[PDB]
RNA sequence: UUUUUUUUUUUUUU
RNA sequence: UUUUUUUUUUUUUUUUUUUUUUUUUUUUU
RNA sequence: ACCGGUGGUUUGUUAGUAUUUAUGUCAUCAACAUGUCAAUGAAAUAUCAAUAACGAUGAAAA
RNA sequence: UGUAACGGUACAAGCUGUAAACAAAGG
RNA sequence: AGGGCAUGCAAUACCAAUCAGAUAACAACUGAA
RNA sequence: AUCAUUGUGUUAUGGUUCUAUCGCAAACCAUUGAGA
RNA sequence: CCUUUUAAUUGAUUAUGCUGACUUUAGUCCCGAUAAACUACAGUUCUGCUUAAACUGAGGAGUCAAGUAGGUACAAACCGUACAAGGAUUAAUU
RNA sequence: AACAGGUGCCAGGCCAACAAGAAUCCGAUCCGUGUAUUCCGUAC
């Protein structure tokens, strides 16, 4: 984990992300550099792949 | 301590009167202030918040002396101090001030 | 008694103030009584007629002894049905309520009156047995404001506005100086 | 390698051969005495 | 004016012990419940009022410290500190709202 | 050691040092140094203290004890 | 030293016959204080000498009671 | 053997010691050693919301 | 250290020597947090 | 407090209580003269500060007699205005407003009676340093009372001495004097001489000091130095997390208990609260599923198995039941075998379950019956 | 060893 | 009256210090 | 069979344990100071009564 | 990351970071 | 982790010949790590 | 069994070292949750 | 208890041995150059040394140490003390 | 090794939300997990 960092939305540079809670209880992820909202994650159905190493073992 | 910004909306400075064992003039009051304030800033604090008439403001640095734990049945021989570092301020007000506030008394 | 380690805490208690219990062991073995005080923190109970050593002086010139504190594991719950000691089992109903069940008889042991239980002012964990005279005061028989006390009518007043706030805040920030001129 | 060990052994020997000794009674030998008693109680255990 | 620093306090030499004891009395701290309903101006004024009360209290505190004695009714300080923290909590949430909104638009 | 922070002395200070040591306690600049030892002071760098009018304020530092019961009673109505 | 850190405890070990008494200086200091209170008009010596529960208004003492037989 | 705070501070101070070909692994009271001290312990039964653990990695 | 001697020496923090050891209060085998 | 203070306070309070009853005609006339009952303190002080030189037991007796005479005169002054007793005696509660009817007057008279027995040599003394227990007992026997009252007089004498001293010192310096008991008390806290240092390590006698010292010594030993921070002494860290502190202010407004006040309650509260967090949510769901499953197949389960599934406990710290780092629990990990899928086997399973249940029930019933029959 | 409105810059000198 | 700042004269850095916080659209009032 | 949560075993009943600082030297450098967080007691929520004696609680006390 | 200084707390081998022992109630 | 979180550890290295410092116009100018 | 008496014998008091844990995985085993 | 086993490094008057306590020498040795008075009807004790002037229109002609050593009840404690504009035009009040 | 913690000291059947004896005799004060006998739970 230490070998990687999160890219800025607009800046496209390594930065930090902080959580903020709204009045309504809505959680928003905001970047440091640009101060912009982070995009949503990719669906697990798209990232699901078969593990052939396990099958070989 | 934290530096004072240009526009101060929620000041945290705490002002108090200090009872000194020395003699003070009629038109002179002794206060205890932080160690990070200026003459001008002190003046303005009193001028705007309290709205008191001010002529002159003097400042001094107060540092507690060293002490050693030697007394008692089980001394530690360790060093320490009593109190804290502060700014002894002296304000020359227009009006007179009673001595029973600024000066100490003991029978 | 003294404070116990947190790992020793009992989440669910089987004994309540005013409950009838019998001491299982000790100096005062084979003596019954009524619960008067329970300590969750210390894991201890108070029972009348048990450990009465302290003495106090009264204005009438007499003396009275107050019972002490004993471990909660040194007492047992008595079954009114059989009038004999028995272990208790806690059972949770569908409705979400917790009940006490006897092991010998198997009967349901109802809880004591809840109105006769008094809690501490600083610590709710410590319960006490309410007295008849104390309860009568609240049944039939029933702090001035200082100079620096906001009125109850003024304190409650509502003045908050979303639109106003948003309008004002923007302006506040927008209209900000950088240098002092009015000072001298 | 000393007089002290003789006193400790004599003390120990004087209490080892008894039953119903309290913790406050045993002293420094409490562990030893408990192990002895538990060892002894081994013979009474059946299938 | 300057008098406010000690007026009504224990330090005041123009009042008796009963008046000081009556003055000593205080209520409960302002909770977030009540503090949320107020506007910016009311909270801004309450901040200065609490600062004045803290400045008055400190003097007594120090006075007591001098003689190696406990200050009468020490809970006042605690109360004032809680109110001061709650006001800033309110304000900070108010701000965070807008920050969030901004972020959203940029995304 | 005879000299240094080893006997409760603490960090070096202006007081406890020869003449010439430069060490403040935290402040804000209000001017600049000339080429002859003078110092020109500027009023621009002085902070401004903002305080609202307190001539007519109903609010007080503390809340009346009776407030608690009144606030509480409102809750039960929502039930 | 107040901190008690120097080698000032070495000499004290050995016995001594006597020590100096700065009476001359002390007297002067006391006199100055006495004067400073006298100009205002309060007696310090009197208060530092009177018996615990003793009351003596003004410049009065044993001598006062002599002629005051009645 | 004279007493010179100037000399002392110019040759034996915090910024002067770092320039020394010494064994810095040794603990120092009045020095900047390089020995690691294992930090704050694990968490028992307190509030989970108030357990501090990081700062320079989290500052924003 | 004298002025002449001090004018020809670098700082210890300028090198990697400070991240080549595991000395700590526990012992001689230190494991960094989050390792 | 001693009789010196309480008597004056009560007399002054009753003075205002009685003054509040007068009508306009009787109050406007008295407004220009005042009442003697409202000026007892001034006379007490001034009479105390009257004699020159030392203060002896004879002077103390004279001063107390003068105070009693002043109170007696004040009683007649009060009676003079009312005069009549046909209706006012009952409409004003004169019985409770009479200074002579107060307990303090009886105490003053008892003090005078005790002092009446003193010998001239003892009366010509200044301090109670040569007073023997046998002498005190003889005085009590002669006065027909207890030694406590006798000692109270010496205490008072000492107090008087002290008062004299303090008054003298204030008057000399030309500073204000306490006007009321309240003020007196307030000031005495930090402005009161109680010792005179002497050379050659000489001892200074003081009954007032002695008694105070004895009381403080009696009240001091009943203390502990465990939880009290000290310099150079290691402080327990684990204890400071659960041990309550009686120094923090209490807030009724706050719902959740303070961790420094009620750790037990604070811990229980969060448990009681709904699930919060991914892990909590997951555990909740997992628990719920089982609950529903078991509810749908109750007949295939025991009472205890069903009951256990109904427990609601959210917000569980990581591994809160470990033997090494966790809570205490008697029932560990327990599982129940699911019924078979084949109805032929299912029926058998059910029958077994019912047999167990019936066994239990029988066992219980037997005990019940036993008790019933035994109750002869 | 530079003295009172702040900087840059050239020659001589008690 | 000194310290501060130019020169002698030196990152020959006196840890927790400074005329030294991002470097002039400053709202001149 | 990865990955998350819970429990147990071994390391380890046979082995061990360190974090704060008074003192030496210009410096390098060296060094295990001083019982315990602690009256005692299982329990102080048992330390009562007070003037000598006899009295109270506690297994044991003044 | 690991540590030193100052301030608060009860001036302390703990805790804490001027908001210096807590927000738990957004219709 | 809702919120907040002064100051010091000399930091353009999430990149780029070497040699002082906020990392040096060529050359003088040199090298076992 | 030689204390003639300044010796010896017994016993008692005093001196006298100082240990109450705040801890226990990164390895192994079992079980369970979503998705292949 | 008996019996088998034990890598315990398992055995003490002594290495001027290492770490502590406590006797003898042993009520022995050690004590710095100058004091006195404070009364029963007034007063100025003797001696050693000799930079002891504090507005006169002029900051007492300097440096350094004390990591605050001439404040304070016959206190080795607590509590105080560093103002370059000198705040008291405080020549007034009572 | 039922060292899994506590309860006054050595507890499978007592507190610890899910099994199982306030079991009997002995005991200097003196509780007493202790000796002797016996019952029961256990896929702990």
PDB file of N, CA, C and O (backbone and C1' of nucleotides) in Angstrom, chain M residues 1-12 35-38, chain P residues 18-20 22-25 27-36:
ATOM      1  P     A M   1      -7.932 -27.667  -0.119  1.00  0.00           P
ATOM      2  O5'   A M   1      -8.050 -26.340  -0.993  1.00  0.00           O
ATOM      3  C5'   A M   1      -7.879 -25.073  -0.484  1.00  0.00           C
ATOM      4  C4'   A M   1      -7.724 -23.979  -1.416  1.00  0.00           C
ATOM      5  C3'   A M   1      -7.546 -22.570  -0.974  1.00  0.00           C
ATOM      6  O3'   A M   1      -6.306 -22.225  -0.429  1.00  0.00           O
ATOM      7  C1'   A M   1      -9.080 -22.645  -2.698  1.00  0.00           C
ATOM      8  P     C M   2      -6.121 -20.911   0.477  1.00  0.00           P
ATOM      9  O5'   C M   2      -6.715 -19.738  -0.423  1.00  0.00           O
ATOM     10  C5'   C M   2      -6.958 -18.473   0.058  1.00  0.00           C
ATOM     11  C4'   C M   2      -6.660 -17.336  -0.787  1.00  0.00           C
ATOM     12  C3'   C M   2      -6.639 -15.943  -0.264  1.00  0.00           C
ATOM     13  O3'   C M   2      -5.551 -15.591   0.543  1.00  0.00           O
ATOM     14  C1'   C M   2      -7.811 -15.991  -2.243  1.00  0.00           C
ATOM     15  P     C M   3      -5.462 -14.179   1.303  1.00  0.00           P
ATOM     16  O5'   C M   3      -6.863 -13.444   1.056  1.00  0.00           O
ATOM     17  C5'   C M   3      -6.907 -12.065   0.743  1.00  0.00           C
ATOM     18  C4'   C M   3      -8.285 -11.456   1.001  1.00  0.00           C
ATOM     19  C3'   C M   3      -8.724 -11.446   2.461  1.00  0.00           C
ATOM     20  O3'   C M   3      -8.152 -10.406   3.245  1.00  0.00           O
ATOM     21  C1'   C M   3     -10.509 -12.158   1.069  1.00  0.00           C
ATOM     22  P     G M   4      -8.113 -10.525   4.844  1.00  0.00           P
ATOM     23  O5'   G M   4      -9.640 -10.290   5.274  1.00  0.00           O
ATOM     24  C5'   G M   4     -10.184  -8.987   5.351  1.00  0.00           C
ATOM     25  C4'   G M   4     -11.649  -8.998   5.796  1.00  0.00           C
ATOM     26  C3'   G M   4     -11.875  -9.499   7.219  1.00  0.00           C
ATOM     27  O3'   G M   4     -11.595  -8.531   8.220  1.00  0.00           O
ATOM     28  C1'   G M   4     -13.470 -10.449   5.743  1.00  0.00           C
ATOM     29  P     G M   5     -10.998  -8.985   9.640  1.00  0.00           P
ATOM     30  O5'   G M   5     -12.250  -9.666  10.362  1.00  0.00           O
ATOM     31  C5'   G M   5     -13.334  -8.890  10.835  1.00  0.00           C
ATOM     32  C4'   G M   5     -14.442  -9.774  11.408  1.00  0.00           C
ATOM     33  C3'   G M   5     -13.995 -10.675  12.552  1.00  0.00           C
ATOM     34  O3'   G M   5     -13.928 -10.012  13.804  1.00  0.00           O
ATOM     35  C1'   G M   5     -15.297 -11.897  10.988  1.00  0.00           C
ATOM     36  P     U M   6     -12.924 -10.533  14.932  1.00  0.00           P
ATOM     37  O5'   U M   6     -13.579 -11.908  15.406  1.00  0.00           O
ATOM     38  C5'   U M   6     -14.819 -11.934  16.087  1.00  0.00           C
ATOM     39  C4'   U M   6     -15.240 -13.363  16.440  1.00  0.00           C
ATOM     40  C3'   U M   6     -14.198 -14.141  17.242  1.00  0.00           C
ATOM     41  O3'   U M   6     -14.180 -13.818  18.623  1.00  0.00           O
ATOM     42  C1'   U M   6     -15.073 -15.476  15.490  1.00  0.00           C
ATOM     43  P     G M   7     -12.819 -13.919  19.448  1.00  0.00           P
ATOM     44  O5'   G M   7     -12.617 -15.500  19.636  1.00  0.00           O
ATOM     45  C5'   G M   7     -13.489 -16.258  20.454  1.00  0.00           C
ATOM     46  C4'   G M   7     -13.316 -17.761  20.219  1.00  0.00           C
ATOM     47  C3'   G M   7     -11.946 -18.303  20.590  1.00  0.00           C
ATOM     48  O3'   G M   7     -11.789 -18.498  21.986  1.00  0.00           O
ATOM     49  C1'   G M   7     -12.643 -19.173  18.508  1.00  0.00           C
ATOM     50  P     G M   8     -10.388 -18.213  22.705  1.00  0.00           P
ATOM     51  O5'   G M   8      -9.564 -19.563  22.456  1.00  0.00           O
ATOM     52  C5'   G M   8     -10.001 -20.797  22.992  1.00  0.00           C
ATOM     53  C4'   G M   8      -9.379 -21.974  22.242  1.00  0.00           C
ATOM     54  C3'   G M   8      -7.865 -22.076  22.363  1.00  0.00           C
ATOM     55  O3'   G M   8      -7.454 -22.701  23.569  1.00  0.00           O
ATOM     56  C1'   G M   8      -8.566 -22.414  20.105  1.00  0.00           C
ATOM     57  P     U M   9      -6.062 -22.312  24.263  1.00  0.00           P
ATOM     58  O5'   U M   9      -4.967 -23.103  23.403  1.00  0.00           O
ATOM     59  C5'   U M   9      -4.886 -24.517  23.436  1.00  0.00           C
ATOM     60  C4'   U M   9      -3.936 -25.052  22.360  1.00  0.00           C
ATOM     61  C3'   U M   9      -2.495 -24.591  22.504  1.00  0.00           C
ATOM     62  O3'   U M   9      -1.774 -25.388  23.430  1.00  0.00           O
ATOM     63  C1'   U M   9      -3.229 -24.382  20.242  1.00  0.00           C
ATOM     64  P     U M  10      -0.617 -24.756  24.338  1.00  0.00           P
ATOM     65  O5'   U M  10       0.625 -24.636  23.342  1.00  0.00           O
ATOM     66  C5'   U M  10       1.217 -25.769  22.743  1.00  0.00           C
ATOM     67  C4'   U M  10       2.185 -25.352  21.634  1.00  0.00           C
ATOM     68  C3'   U M  10       3.241 -24.342  22.070  1.00  0.00           C
ATOM     69  O3'   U M  10       4.367 -24.983  22.656  1.00  0.00           O
ATOM     70  C1'   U M  10       2.233 -23.696  20.007  1.00  0.00           C
ATOM     71  P     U M  11       4.995 -24.441  24.015  1.00  0.00           P
ATOM     72  O5'   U M  11       6.040 -23.334  23.524  1.00  0.00           O
ATOM     73  C5'   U M  11       7.003 -23.594  22.522  1.00  0.00           C
ATOM     74  C4'   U M  11       7.242 -22.360  21.643  1.00  0.00           C
ATOM     75  C3'   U M  11       7.734 -21.132  22.388  1.00  0.00           C
ATOM     76  O3'   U M  11       9.123 -21.171  22.648  1.00  0.00           O
ATOM     77  C1'   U M  11       5.982 -20.537  20.929  1.00  0.00           C
ATOM     78  P     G M  12       9.692 -20.755  24.084  1.00  0.00           P
ATOM     79  O5'   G M  12       8.679 -21.439  25.119  1.00  0.00           O
ATOM     80  C5'   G M  12       9.000 -21.542  26.493  1.00  0.00           C
ATOM     81  C4'   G M  12       7.756 -21.505  27.374  1.00  0.00           C
ATOM     82  C3'   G M  12       6.659 -22.490  26.966  1.00  0.00           C
ATOM     83  O3'   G M  12       5.993 -22.977  28.123  1.00  0.00           O
ATOM     84  C1'   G M  12       5.855 -20.305  26.925  1.00  0.00           C
ATOM     85  P     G M  35      14.385   2.253  48.823  1.00  0.00           P
ATOM     86  O5'   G M  35      14.055   1.167  47.704  1.00  0.00           O
ATOM     87  C5'   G M  35      12.808   1.034  47.142  1.00  0.00           C
ATOM     88  C4'   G M  35      12.213  -0.282  47.087  1.00  0.00           C
ATOM     89  C3'   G M  35      10.879  -0.524  46.476  1.00  0.00           C
ATOM     90  O3'   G M  35      10.816  -0.493  45.080  1.00  0.00           O
ATOM     91  C1'   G M  35      11.030  -1.660  48.488  1.00  0.00           C
ATOM     92  P     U M  36      10.025   0.640  44.268  1.00  0.00           P
ATOM     93  O5'   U M  36       8.510   0.130  44.336  1.00  0.00           O
ATOM     94  C5'   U M  36       8.097  -1.063  43.697  1.00  0.00           C
ATOM     95  C4'   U M  36       6.651  -1.408  44.059  1.00  0.00           C
ATOM     96  C3'   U M  36       5.653  -0.281  43.798  1.00  0.00           C
ATOM     97  O3'   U M  36       5.229  -0.207  42.444  1.00  0.00           O
ATOM     98  C1'   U M  36       5.305  -1.212  45.943  1.00  0.00           C
ATOM     99  P     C M  37       5.299   1.190  41.656  1.00  0.00           P
ATOM    100  O5'   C M  37       4.124   2.045  42.326  1.00  0.00           O
ATOM    101  C5'   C M  37       3.945   3.412  42.011  1.00  0.00           C
ATOM    102  C4'   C M  37       2.501   3.850  42.264  1.00  0.00           C
ATOM    103  C3'   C M  37       1.976   3.499  43.650  1.00  0.00           C
ATOM    104  O3'   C M  37       2.346   4.431  44.652  1.00  0.00           O
ATOM    105  C1'   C M  37       0.386   2.922  41.991  1.00  0.00           C
ATOM    106  P     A M  38       3.019   3.913  46.009  1.00  0.00           P
ATOM    107  O5'   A M  38       1.799   3.256  46.796  1.00  0.00           O
ATOM    108  C5'   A M  38       0.717   3.973  47.263  1.00  0.00           C
ATOM    109  C4'   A M  38      -0.029   3.328  48.318  1.00  0.00           C
ATOM    110  C3'   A M  38       0.741   2.830  49.491  1.00  0.00           C
ATOM    111  O3'   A M  38       0.113   2.911  50.757  1.00  0.00           O
ATOM    112  C1'   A M  38      -0.236   1.045  48.400  1.00  0.00           C
TER     113        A M  38
ATOM    114  P     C P  18      17.294  -5.455  48.695  1.00  0.00           P
ATOM    115  O5'   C P  18      15.759  -5.845  48.532  1.00  0.00           O
ATOM    116  C5'   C P  18      15.334  -7.086  48.124  1.00  0.00           C
ATOM    117  C4'   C P  18      14.016  -7.462  48.573  1.00  0.00           C
ATOM    118  C3'   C P  18      12.827  -6.850  47.928  1.00  0.00           C
ATOM    119  O3'   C P  18      12.480  -7.341  46.667  1.00  0.00           O
ATOM    120  C1'   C P  18      12.584  -6.776  50.228  1.00  0.00           C
ATOM    121  P     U P  19      11.571  -6.501  45.642  1.00  0.00           P
ATOM    122  O5'   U P  19      10.513  -7.568  45.112  1.00  0.00           O
ATOM    123  C5'   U P  19      10.094  -7.646  43.800  1.00  0.00           C
ATOM    124  C4'   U P  19       9.373  -8.848  43.464  1.00  0.00           C
ATOM    125  C3'   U P  19       8.083  -9.116  44.158  1.00  0.00           C
ATOM    126  O3'   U P  19       7.111  -9.733  43.351  1.00  0.00           O
ATOM    127  C1'   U P  19       9.572 -10.802  44.656  1.00  0.00           C
ATOM    128  P     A P  20       6.061  -8.886  42.492  1.00  0.00           P
ATOM    129  O5'   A P  20       4.744  -8.864  43.413  1.00  0.00           O
ATOM    130  C5'   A P  20       3.986 -10.044  43.628  1.00  0.00           C
ATOM    131  C4'   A P  20       2.492  -9.739  43.761  1.00  0.00           C
ATOM    132  C3'   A P  20       1.925  -8.949  42.576  1.00  0.00           C
ATOM    133  O3'   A P  20       0.584  -9.345  42.298  1.00  0.00           O
ATOM    134  C1'   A P  20       1.636  -7.744  44.584  1.00  0.00           C
ATOM    135  P     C P  22      -1.664  -6.150  36.984  1.00  0.00           P
ATOM    136  O5'   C P  22      -1.488  -5.669  35.467  1.00  0.00           O
ATOM    137  C5'   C P  22      -2.621  -5.366  34.675  1.00  0.00           C
ATOM    138  C4'   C P  22      -2.256  -4.444  33.512  1.00  0.00           C
ATOM    139  C3'   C P  22      -1.206  -5.012  32.552  1.00  0.00           C
ATOM    140  O3'   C P  22      -1.478  -4.550  31.235  1.00  0.00           O
ATOM    141  C1'   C P  22      -0.436  -3.008  33.533  1.00  0.00           C
ATOM    142  P     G P  23      -2.331  -5.440  30.217  1.00  0.00           P
ATOM    143  O5'   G P  23      -1.196  -6.315  29.502  1.00  0.00           O
ATOM    144  C5'   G P  23      -0.229  -5.723  28.646  1.00  0.00           C
ATOM    145  C4'   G P  23       0.821  -6.741  28.204  1.00  0.00           C
ATOM    146  C3'   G P  23       0.272  -7.839  27.295  1.00  0.00           C
ATOM    147  O3'   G P  23       0.201  -7.433  25.934  1.00  0.00           O
ATOM    148  C1'   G P  23       1.631  -8.767  29.011  1.00  0.00           C
ATOM    149  P     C P  24      -0.948  -8.001  24.970  1.00  0.00           P
ATOM    150  O5'   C P  24      -0.455  -9.490  24.646  1.00  0.00           O
ATOM    151  C5'   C P  24       0.726  -9.734  23.906  1.00  0.00           C
ATOM    152  C4'   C P  24       1.219 -11.164  24.124  1.00  0.00           C
ATOM    153  C3'   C P  24       0.281 -12.235  23.580  1.00  0.00           C
ATOM    154  O3'   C P  24       0.450 -12.469  22.191  1.00  0.00           O
ATOM    155  C1'   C P  24       0.991 -12.797  25.780  1.00  0.00           C
ATOM    156  P     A P  25      -0.834 -12.613  21.239  1.00  0.00           P
ATOM    157  O5'   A P  25      -0.239 -12.406  19.766  1.00  0.00           O
ATOM    158  C5'   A P  25       0.479 -11.233  19.436  1.00  0.00           C
ATOM    159  C4'   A P  25       1.190 -11.369  18.088  1.00  0.00           C
ATOM    160  C3'   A P  25       0.243 -11.615  16.908  1.00  0.00           C
ATOM    161  O3'   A P  25       0.740 -10.934  15.756  1.00  0.00           O
ATOM    162  C1'   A P  25       1.777 -13.390  17.110  1.00  0.00           C
ATOM    163  P     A P  27       1.525 -15.493   9.527  1.00  0.00           P
ATOM    164  O5'   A P  27       1.984 -16.837  10.259  1.00  0.00           O
ATOM    165  C5'   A P  27       3.209 -17.470   9.933  1.00  0.00           C
ATOM    166  C4'   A P  27       3.410 -18.752  10.740  1.00  0.00           C
ATOM    167  C3'   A P  27       2.228 -19.713  10.697  1.00  0.00           C
ATOM    168  O3'   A P  27       2.199 -20.499   9.516  1.00  0.00           O
ATOM    169  C1'   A P  27       3.035 -19.476  12.923  1.00  0.00           C
ATOM    170  P     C P  28       0.816 -20.808   8.769  1.00  0.00           P
ATOM    171  O5'   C P  28       0.202 -21.994   9.651  1.00  0.00           O
ATOM    172  C5'   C P  28       0.853 -23.245   9.768  1.00  0.00           C
ATOM    173  C4'   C P  28       0.264 -24.072  10.912  1.00  0.00           C
ATOM    174  C3'   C P  28      -1.233 -24.327  10.797  1.00  0.00           C
ATOM    175  O3'   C P  28      -1.553 -25.387   9.907  1.00  0.00           O
ATOM    176  C1'   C P  28      -0.676 -23.663  13.002  1.00  0.00           C
ATOM    177  P     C P  29      -2.883 -25.327   9.017  1.00  0.00           P
ATOM    178  O5'   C P  29      -4.023 -25.758  10.052  1.00  0.00           O
ATOM    179  C5'   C P  29      -4.048 -27.053  10.619  1.00  0.00           C
ATOM    180  C4'   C P  29      -5.017 -27.124  11.806  1.00  0.00           C
ATOM    181  C3'   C P  29      -6.468 -26.803  11.456  1.00  0.00           C
ATOM    182  O3'   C P  29      -7.152 -27.899  10.870  1.00  0.00           O
ATOM    183  C1'   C P  29      -5.828 -25.676  13.445  1.00  0.00           C
ATOM    184  P     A P  30      -8.242 -27.655   9.721  1.00  0.00           P
ATOM    185  O5'   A P  30      -9.553 -27.257  10.546  1.00  0.00           O
ATOM    186  C5'   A P  30     -10.165 -28.176  11.433  1.00  0.00           C
ATOM    187  C4'   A P  30     -11.129 -27.465  12.381  1.00  0.00           C
ATOM    188  C3'   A P  30     -12.261 -26.720  11.693  1.00  0.00           C
ATOM    189  O3'   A P  30     -13.333 -27.569  11.309  1.00  0.00           O
ATOM    190  C1'   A P  30     -11.291 -25.364  13.384  1.00  0.00           C
ATOM    191  P     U P  31     -14.108 -27.327   9.929  1.00  0.00           P
ATOM    192  O5'   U P  31     -15.089 -26.115  10.280  1.00  0.00           O
ATOM    193  C5'   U P  31     -16.100 -26.250  11.252  1.00  0.00           C
ATOM    194  C4'   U P  31     -16.593 -24.886  11.734  1.00  0.00           C
ATOM    195  C3'   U P  31     -17.196 -24.013  10.644  1.00  0.00           C
ATOM    196  O3'   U P  31     -18.539 -24.355  10.345  1.00  0.00           O
ATOM    197  C1'   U P  31     -15.691 -22.750  11.970  1.00  0.00           C
ATOM    198  P     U P  32     -19.102 -24.239   8.851  1.00  0.00           P
ATOM    199  O5'   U P  32     -19.457 -22.684   8.715  1.00  0.00           O
ATOM    200  C5'   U P  32     -20.449 -22.081   9.519  1.00  0.00           C
ATOM    201  C4'   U P  32     -20.271 -20.560   9.571  1.00  0.00           C
ATOM    202  C3'   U P  32     -20.445 -19.861   8.230  1.00  0.00           C
ATOM    203  O3'   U P  32     -21.804 -19.642   7.885  1.00  0.00           O
ATOM    204  C1'   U P  32     -18.509 -19.053   9.326  1.00  0.00           C
ATOM    205  P     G P  33     -22.245 -19.534   6.348  1.00  0.00           P
ATOM    206  O5'   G P  33     -21.826 -18.043   5.947  1.00  0.00           O
ATOM    207  C5'   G P  33     -22.590 -16.926   6.365  1.00  0.00           C
ATOM    208  C4'   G P  33     -22.048 -15.626   5.767  1.00  0.00           C
ATOM    209  C3'   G P  33     -21.920 -15.652   4.249  1.00  0.00           C
ATOM    210  O3'   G P  33     -23.150 -15.386   3.591  1.00  0.00           O
ATOM    211  C1'   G P  33     -19.955 -14.735   5.231  1.00  0.00           C
ATOM    212  P     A P  34     -23.494 -16.077   2.183  1.00  0.00           P
ATOM    213  O5'   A P  34     -22.851 -15.097   1.105  1.00  0.00           O
ATOM    214  C5'   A P  34     -23.255 -13.797   0.917  1.00  0.00           C
ATOM    215  C4'   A P  34     -22.405 -13.021   0.049  1.00  0.00           C
ATOM    216  C3'   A P  34     -22.158 -13.524  -1.327  1.00  0.00           C
ATOM    217  O3'   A P  34     -23.190 -13.343  -2.254  1.00  0.00           O
ATOM    218  C1'   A P  34     -20.151 -12.913  -0.358  1.00  0.00           C
ATOM    219  P     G P  35     -23.496 -14.409  -3.418  1.00  0.00           P
ATOM    220  O5'   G P  35     -22.249 -14.272  -4.400  1.00  0.00           O
ATOM    221  C5'   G P  35     -21.886 -13.093  -5.009  1.00  0.00           C
ATOM    222  C4'   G P  35     -20.574 -13.102  -5.607  1.00  0.00           C
ATOM    223  C3'   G P  35     -20.277 -14.124  -6.644  1.00  0.00           C
ATOM    224  O3'   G P  35     -20.815 -13.903  -7.915  1.00  0.00           O
ATOM    225  C1'   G P  35     -18.546 -14.052  -5.112  1.00  0.00           C
ATOM    226  P     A P  36     -20.985 -15.092  -8.983  1.00  0.00           P
ATOM    227  O5'   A P  36     -19.487 -15.520  -9.313  1.00  0.00           O
ATOM    228  C5'   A P  36     -19.212 -16.663 -10.109  1.00  0.00           C
ATOM    229  C4'   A P  36     -17.730 -16.831 -10.334  1.00  0.00           C
ATOM    230  C3'   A P  36     -17.294 -18.158 -10.937  1.00  0.00           C
ATOM    231  O3'   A P  36     -17.444 -18.201 -12.345  1.00  0.00           O
ATOM    232  C1'   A P  36     -15.926 -17.650  -9.077  1.00  0.00           C
TER     233        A P  36
END
